Design a binder for these strands. Structure first.
Ligand code: DGT
Ligand code: CA
Ligand code: CA
Length: 341
DNA sequence: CGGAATCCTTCCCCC
DNA sequence: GGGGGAAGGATTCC
């Protein structure tokens, strides 16, 4: 069992560089402008020249401009990066039929039925980086190990423009060595629950009654962690498919006025519908981010698919429900369609 | 900002 | 008691 994970590098900013090489060498910040005030928004990603000063995905655009007033600030163009990504996925399909496209910039490849050992996995590594570099001008990091989790961990160590193998004898040392927060699927909230249990390394999950662990972090995440620490995790590479599609926009002002919120909501539906392209949902959820940034949703499943006119009027009922059931002003409003026929 | 998956918890109907 | 859903939220990741 040999897994090869590819993670493109600083992907949105790099696509922006490829499309305008005069940017190379500069710090580049791809931005999501919310539109409220000048430079309201967040940073979607930054290249390494900007990242080394603390500019990174998550921080407000206004914060990045204090740090790096003279960086280049580009608005996010998802559709472009999506096409460039689709193209790259096609290159990887030629190295395995068993391919799992995990996100816009990450894929796993099952190269058992191609390569015989780590030495050859590695070479396939350079072949692939070099192909993508030649054909699309994009640098990627490659991680290789015996399962998907360690393949990813590998790339994270090796990025950017890296390649790295984590072999069976190293898996074993990491299970002891590796900080459990650095395991994929463990965010701040789970890492904290684990400290309180005394777990700071994968291996520690063996010192705990399964039922205490299960009760603290859920059964699913408990099994996941235990199987990992037992050198036994072994999920297969599977083609996955969109289960939902939606759009949330930010309003100019916060509001509780139905007539004020409706147009943003309609525009969210319009765009969601465009994005569905020949796919029909039986579920609709209306999603609202309140002023103190909590997220309240209200949904409805139909026994048939949902036409646009239906989605329009049903979404208004769901928005009225939210307003009736939650006292705060609304900041961001949108829709999500799911359960495709 | 934004997009999305997966999971957990509660509730519900009902054999 | 437990199968079988749906709803709404928690949490995660890019
Ligand atoms: N709008 C938005 N987009 C994000 C965010 N995080 C990641 N992305 C998008 C843009 C990124 O270029 C792309 C890839 O995610 P990554 O976590 O792998 O970041 P990055 O491209 O910098 O990877 P890298 O560290 O260079 O290997 O997905 C985010 O918080 N907001
Ligand atoms: Ca990336
Ligand atoms: Ca981490």
């Amino acid at each position: 069992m040999i897994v090869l994970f590819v993670d493109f590098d600083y992907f949105y900013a790099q696509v922006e560089e490829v499309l305008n090489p005069s940017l190379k060498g500069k710090p580049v910040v791809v931005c999501v402008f919310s539109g409220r005030f000048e430079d309201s928004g967040a940073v979607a990603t930054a290249n390494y020249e900007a990242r080394k000063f603390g500019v990174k995905a998550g921080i407000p655009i206004v914060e990045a401009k204090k740090i790096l007033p003279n960086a280049v600030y580009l608005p996010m163009r998802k559709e472009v990066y999506q096409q460039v990504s689709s193209r790259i996925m096609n290159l990887l399909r030629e190295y395995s039929e068993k391919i799992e496209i995990a996100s816009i910039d990450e894929a796993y490849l099952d190269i058992s039925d191609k390569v015989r050992d780590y030495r050859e996995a590695y070479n396939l590594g350079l072949e692939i980086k070099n192909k993508i570099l030649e054909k699309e001008k994009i640098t990627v990091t490659v991680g290789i190990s015996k399962n998907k989790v360690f393949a990813k961990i590998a790339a994270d160590m090796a990025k950017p423009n890296g390649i790295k193998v984590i072999d069976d004898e190293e898996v074993k040392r990491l299970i002891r060595e590796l900080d459990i927060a650095d395991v994929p699927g463990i965010g701040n909230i789970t890492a904290e629950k684990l400290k309180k249990l005394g777990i700071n390394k994968l291996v520690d999950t063996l010192s705990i009654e399964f039922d205490k662990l299960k009760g603290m972090i859920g059964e699913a995440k408990a099994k996941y962690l235990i199987s990992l620490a037992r050198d036994e995790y072994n999920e297969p590479i599977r083609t996955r498919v969109r289960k939902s599609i939606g759009r949330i926009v930010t309003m100019k002002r916060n509001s509780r006025n139905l007539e004020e919120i409706k147009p943003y909501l309609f525009r969210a539906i319009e765009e969601s519908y465009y994005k569905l392209d020949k796919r029909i949902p039986k579920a609709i959820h209306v999603v609202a981010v309140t002023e103190d940034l909590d997220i309240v949703s209200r949904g409805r499943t139909f026994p048939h698919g949902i036409s646009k006119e239906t989605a329009y009027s049903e979404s208004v009922k769901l928005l009225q429900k939210i307003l009736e059931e939650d006292e705060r002003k609304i900041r961001r409003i949108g829709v999500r369609f799911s359960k495709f026929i």
